[PDB]
């Protein structure tokens, strides 16, 4: 059950502050080693994920270029990466097959453009 990753979740910016998120980040929960894996053309991140009251978190160890996430995109990425760590809960509305990233009572990111 717990070992199926390398599954490209194209991250989606929902909230207005994340509209600057880069070209395209690939999110993949590594359920095989149980770690967060977030990588793209220019970023390489591992993390360990923990749960608190349904909030999915992840302490990251990302290595990443500057310029490829421009400046505000990198900010977007810090924003996104801080979200998980603050406790992002996967869930939303009108979805049954796609993952959505929400924290502070609203979705600001998604895995795949399901909705």
């Amino acid at each position: 059950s717990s070992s199926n990753s390398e599954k490209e979740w194209h991250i989606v910016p929902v909230s207005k502050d994340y509209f600057s998120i880069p070209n395209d980040l690939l999110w993949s929960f590594n359920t095989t080693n149980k770690s967060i894996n977030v990588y793209s053309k220019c970023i390489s991140g591992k993390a360990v994920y923990s749960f608190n009251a349904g909030k999915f978190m992840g302490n990251f160890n990302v290595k990443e270029v500057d310029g490829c996430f421009m400046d505000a995109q990198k900010i977007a990425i810090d924003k996104l990466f801080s979200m998980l760590k603050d406790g992002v809960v996967l869930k939303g509305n009108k979805i049954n097959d796609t993952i959505l990233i929400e924290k502070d009572g609203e979705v600001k990111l998604k895995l795949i453009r399901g909705i």
């Binding site: 059950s1 717990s2 070992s3 199926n4 990753s5 599954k7 929960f29 359920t31 149980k34 994920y49 749960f51 349904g54 909030k55 999915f56 809960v89 996967l90 869930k91 939303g92 509305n93 009108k94 979805i95 049954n96 796609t98 993952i99 959505l100």
Partner: peptide
């Protein structure tokens, strides 16, 4: 379990390993 869920590792991977 839910619209998306994944509030538990098991329920998370049960949803990922689909």
């Amino acid at each position: 379990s839910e619209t998306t869920l994944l509030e538990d590792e098991k329920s998370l991977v049960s949803y990922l390993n689909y």
